[model samples]
Target: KVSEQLKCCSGILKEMFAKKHAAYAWPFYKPVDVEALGLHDYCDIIKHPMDMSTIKSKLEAREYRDAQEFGADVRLMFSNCYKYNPPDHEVVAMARKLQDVFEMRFAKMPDE
Candidate 1:
């Protein structure tokens, strides 16, 4: 059974995930509440962001397919996080990549 909270979160998550998919190849599908999956804040990431940028930009540029693939990359990053003892650089790179993706993807968003 799904909770109302999850429903609300999922809508946000789906938008974020779509943005992620647009930016990268693999995105973590695991729920944030799960241990080891980690939590990612949309606003925080938007500021100190990565993958979502690519998606946002691509969408703006009408590069919809590329953006989707990038989003997939996010899942792949999550997979690597789960499987390998990726070096700190690799992890940081992945995180940074996510930021770049978001910024690139969402270039059209209004700045605060």
Candidate 2:
């Protein structure tokens, strides 16, 4: 039932990356380019680099044994964004809003 589990858990995430959120999601769609961004401090600070594409791949890979495991990565992505960016930065603002959506959908997930 692992595939079935991941399938249901992946629904909301596909929408999260759709055109509706494309602008706000561009930054997180792929893994951060440390060298391209010249973020020397990134490696030292954000030990765990998470992104939407990575999570998407994980879901497709059925790597998440449970929905909470998927949630952990989603939250980690936001945490990394918040910890690295300023409080008032647009990225942080985006993170908060997206996190709300994630939680709202998460609560209604079908758990077995």
Candidate 3:
């Protein structure tokens, strides 16, 4: 049963990675480069950092208890993006679209 849940979450994230044109998924594939990007206050702005790679790593390591925890990390990635970036930023829109798909699919994941 837990394995099935893991499979489902993995498949959902894989689909997110497959989406193109939006080019949204690419940006969040790994953690943000705050130092190189010159984000002086990034640490103050976002308390929790997350990314797609970390999500996959957690899944691979069996760190997530279920789809619920997996989904939390997914949302955490986007929410942090939203908090650090302005509303009009292109990343915000991209993040919004990907999150739209994720939330919809996650809604249907039914707790197991």
Candidate 4:
């Protein structure tokens, strides 16, 4: 379940970066100024190599409030990273899709 979430979220980010900004690779590590990619800086900070330990812990302990908050925090990375010249509806659409998935996932979890 966690893997699926990560994969879907990652795909959205990748697509937005490529399709909208024409960034086919990791823009942060390149020699170009990362600040130009406004949204990437907002998103990449939380897109570290770490897995779902913190998110899992919140859900495992039945802390739905904290879990959803955490999920939203994570979701921000995917939803906010679309730096483009004229803007892209595809990025906005994908962000909405990601938000729906996560909100539904959190809502479906049993409350303690």
Q: In the order shown, what is each candidate's alpha-carbon RMSD?
A: 13.9, 1.6, 1.6, 9.5
Q: Model 1 over residues 11-38: C-alpha lDDT tens digits? A: 3335656744534424433323323544
Q: In model 4, which range of ten residues has the least summed lDDT? A: 23-32
Which of the numbered candidates is closest to the native, going by highest lDDT? 3
Instruction: Order the candidate numbers by TM-score, best to worst.
Output: 3, 2, 4, 1
Residue-wise lDDT of candidate 3 within 1-112, one digit each (tens)? 7778788899888888785623778888889989998998988999999999899899889999988789889989999999999999999999998998888887777556
Candidate 4 local lDDT, 1-112, one digit each (tens):
5444444444433443354434322332122234684546443543432123343444456453444455574454443344322256654554455445445555554444
Instruction: Give me the displacement of residue 13 in model 2, in angstroms.
Output: 1.4
Clashes of each: 44, 0, 0, 0
Better of 2 and 3 by TM-score: 3
The better-scoring model by lDDT among 2 and 4 is 2
Give the poorly placed runs of model 2, Cα more than 4 Å off.
1-5
Clashing pairs in 3: none
How far in Å is the alpha carbon of 3 misplaced in model 2? 5.3
Whole-model Cα lDDT of every candidate shown, in order: 0.42, 0.84, 0.87, 0.43
TM-score of each: 0.27, 0.89, 0.91, 0.35
Which TM-score value belongs to model 1?
A: 0.27
Who is ahead in TM-score, 3 or 4?
3
